[PDB]
Amino acid sequence: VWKDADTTLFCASDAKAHETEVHNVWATHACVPTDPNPQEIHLENVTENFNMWKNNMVEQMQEDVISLWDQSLQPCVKLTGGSVIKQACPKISFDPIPIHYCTPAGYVILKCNDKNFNGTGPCKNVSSVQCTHGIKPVVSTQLLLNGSLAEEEIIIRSENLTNNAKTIIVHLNKSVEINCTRPSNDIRKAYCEINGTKWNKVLKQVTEKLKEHFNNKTIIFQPPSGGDLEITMHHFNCRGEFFYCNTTQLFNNTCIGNETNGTITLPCKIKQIINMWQGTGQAMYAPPIDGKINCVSNITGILLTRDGGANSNETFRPGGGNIKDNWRSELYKYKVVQIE
Amino acid sequence: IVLTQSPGTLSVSPGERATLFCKASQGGNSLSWYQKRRGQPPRLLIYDTSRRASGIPDRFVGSGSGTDFSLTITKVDRDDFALYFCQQFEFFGLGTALEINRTVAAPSVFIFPPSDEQLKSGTASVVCLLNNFYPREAKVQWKVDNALQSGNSQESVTEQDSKDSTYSLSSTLTLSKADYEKHKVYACEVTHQGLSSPVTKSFNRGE
Amino acid sequence: LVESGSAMRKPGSSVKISCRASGFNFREYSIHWVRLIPGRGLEWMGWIKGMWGAVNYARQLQGRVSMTRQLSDDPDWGVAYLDFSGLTSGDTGEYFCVRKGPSCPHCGDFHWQHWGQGTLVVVSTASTKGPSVFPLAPSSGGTAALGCLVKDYFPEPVTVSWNSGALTSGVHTFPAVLQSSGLYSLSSVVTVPSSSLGTQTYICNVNHKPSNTKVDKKVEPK
């Protein structure tokens, strides 16, 4: 017997002291070494209600990742609305590492072992674990990178589908690699290669799983209707450089069975003047570094907001923005409770 | 999702109990309620089926489940007579208007011939008044030399005058100078409900 | 929430309505725009986040609407903007900027407790024109009515006072109606005892500010 409670968790990882990489520097003092032998007790005949949209584990992880970026990534000059903060801006190795969240003495994390569980309903097959699995704190928009694939089939996640003001999280069952590349000598010009033959095959499965929640009507995709550059295009950080990828021919689709040259390429650019997700305004970074910048990631999730109005067709446009929704993509089956 | 507000207009005496409806098409959710008095922006009353907002009297009681919803006002105040809208997310209802109920009132029908100064403009407009009446269900016909008009007249009714909760209305029949000088008798048949006989006020061309 | 003043445009034009926001974390809350088109009910047009400015426009207004956010440490500060292109004749009404007022966290993103003062926008092919005044001479037995006919004017409104004030008894100033010519017109009558004719003077004062037109019209019995 337990109750839904909230406490201050501690993070766990495998940060290496020899590594000069940002996440390794942060997780070697703010976290503890990962336990070599994690135990897990499987429990049946016991149900439990979950809610990823009201999970304290997310707000804590959010407060930790924002501290990771305020600790290391220091831009040249930073605007505070009216004042400036001019510091030093040296380049650094940027690559997210798996971070586990555990409970102190007196608390236990509950894990939902239900395959097709979205994150709001009750779970019949629930297990108890001391720590969460490997979660990479990757900050990105529109497309979720380096996460966990669906257990068996695509799972649709949303606070409420009938509400158009709530972002939608898609849990892909099969991943699609992206071959992003910034060649070295045209210095701003970047690339992003996606297998279009398997993209329209995996995007159609997303629609069909979504069409089940919408009275058997057609579904059309389109680029976002507006906003800042951090949300209107595929924003993600790779090798310390902030990428901005146009995904016009990526959400250029319609749905019946499937609908949509060389494989689809996404024109990207590197901006030194970006809007921080820390919520302190706009900042300017040092110019891009020489060499071949390549960022091979994995598409595992999509962030959507249903274009609503007075409709028989539903329009879905990409756009996450709130990175708190990114952690929910993995912390959906976890909840901190207080023992007896 | 279809939000159907019935009946659209409700006559309630100041102190009686009012009951509005909001039968939705797709259920399994909640509903809000918005009040709008003329001259002021709409105000939130009830959110999530049955929850009041800040600075709202307890006389406003919400309820309902599934598809059927209802807004009830225990003892209607004199300031509660306004337009009420219901909301589901982005969708709204057409709105119901709370009306002050009172005894019937016979309209005092008046007719005004167009001015000679007006005839110099090339057009002629004759109007009817029939002010102070209840309810706002009237029927002005406009008959010139026993000829019925349809498509050349506009009426304009005022909201209930709070001092007696009565109406007024004003039907204006506009014609050209050439068509006005062609005829003689201009009548105005009024079919309300006060007195079984349709009151008709008329005048002949000249004086 | 403070919006701009009343604006009037030509058909096929565009209108930019601002919406000053303060007293709340703008980055965490949304600003929706709802228009009240007469006899059609409230219509939700779209919302705008203060964080990254994600927008959700209504399907039946595509290629016509566009919302931009302005900002500035006292965060709360900032202005929301609504752009409305492709103006037709049926887009005339009150346009509100709405927001979930300072209340419960349970309140959804459509439970708006706070409403702006509203922005009236009239779009037509007409132009600013002073009104013409036609006297409604009373008929010929006991308590008859007399009034003034304000015809062919644009735009709203017109203020009608009788005898420069001091006469506010049985006065009925009807709401304006839109003729087929595209110009407004209304009547303003006053019920008066039949024994007070020829001895009492009755004057109506019609005023039209947008076309700077003032008229002191008198009414005599037949």
Ligand SMILES: *[C@@H]1O[C@H](CO[C@@H]2O[C@@H](C)[C@@H](O)[C@@H](O)[C@@H]2O)[C@@H](O[C@@H]2O[C@H](CO)[C@@H](O)[C@H](O)[C@H]2NC(C)=O)[C@H](O)[C@H]1NC(C)=O
């Ligand atoms: C609407 O109201 C009428 C009138 O009721 C009255 O007027 C009010 C201003 C208030 O002063 C009341 O005390 C008055 O009684 C109701 O009229 C009824 O009509 C029938 C038939 O004509 C008559 O037999 C009844 O006596 C009237 N009612 C009373 C209380 O005497 C009418 O029923 C009301 N209808 C609704 C739907 O509210």
Ligand SMILES: *[C@@H]1O[C@H](CO)[C@@H](O)[C@H](O)[C@H]1NC(C)=O
């Ligand atoms: C519950 O989940 C565990 C692991 O996720 C699995 O081994 C077990 O078979 C599941 N229970 C049932 C009844 O399938």
Ligand SMILES: *[C@@H]1O[C@H](CO)[C@@H](O)[C@H](O)[C@H]1NC(C)=O
């Ligand atoms: C999640 O699954 C539960 C099943 O218990 C269902 O009730 C709920 O509507 C689902 N939510 C979404 C967003 O699919």
Ligand SMILES: *[C@@H]1O[C@H](CO)[C@@H](O)[C@H](O)[C@H]1NC(C)=O
């Ligand atoms: C992406 O490219 C398309 C052209 O295919 C362009 O219309 C659109 O504005 C671009 N979006 C950006 C730059 O955000």
Ligand SMILES: *[C@@H]1O[C@H](CO)[C@@H](O)[C@H](O)[C@H]1NC(C)=O
């Ligand atoms: C989809 O792509 C075509 C050309 O490939 C383009 O004309 C069209 O505008 C695109 N649709 C969008 C951007 O919604």
Ligand SMILES: *[C@@H]1O[C@H](CO)[C@@H](O)[C@H](O)[C@H]1NC(C)=O
């Ligand atoms: C995802 O992981 C791969 C391999 O671990 C790495 O190359 C890539 O940079 C990661 N994605 C991001 C956005 O860092």
Ligand SMILES: *[C@@H]1O[C@H](CO)[C@@H](O)[C@H](O)[C@H]1NC(C)=O
């Ligand atoms: C969310 O949707 C469910 C049904 O899908 C409904 O019961 C609930 O009231 C909704 N919540 C909000 C805040 O609209």
